[PDB]
Amino acid sequence: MDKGTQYKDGYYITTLNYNFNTVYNATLQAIQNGQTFDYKSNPYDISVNKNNGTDAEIVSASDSDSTDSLQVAMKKLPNNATRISIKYGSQGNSIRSSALIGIIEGNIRYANTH
Secondary structure, eight states, X not given: OOSOOEXXXXXXXXXXXXXXXXXXXXXXXXXXXXXXXXXXXXOOOXXXXXXXXXXXXXXXXXXXXXXXXXXXXXXXXXXXXXXXXXXXXXXXXXXHHHHHHHHHHHHHHHHHOX
């Protein structure tokens, strides 16, 4: 039905039916190039960016948000899909993440088209 967007206890987890290569690119752009700002204008910038090959995971630390860090996990599926797992702070990071996903998929939709 849907790609697989699940929200549970602050966690935002989804599958994106697009290639891990483009998903990494889009996700990087979304956070790194400041394609999304929060109302509290909090530091979104990346503290660890690492590629594995089946993993690409972005970890940014939040100094202003004492409650946690921004962690986005991108996992490569052999079905030309990518699984994204978001890490939340006690305030509910799912809000940031829902916008994040829109940007990630949307950017792919422009670049990839079909």
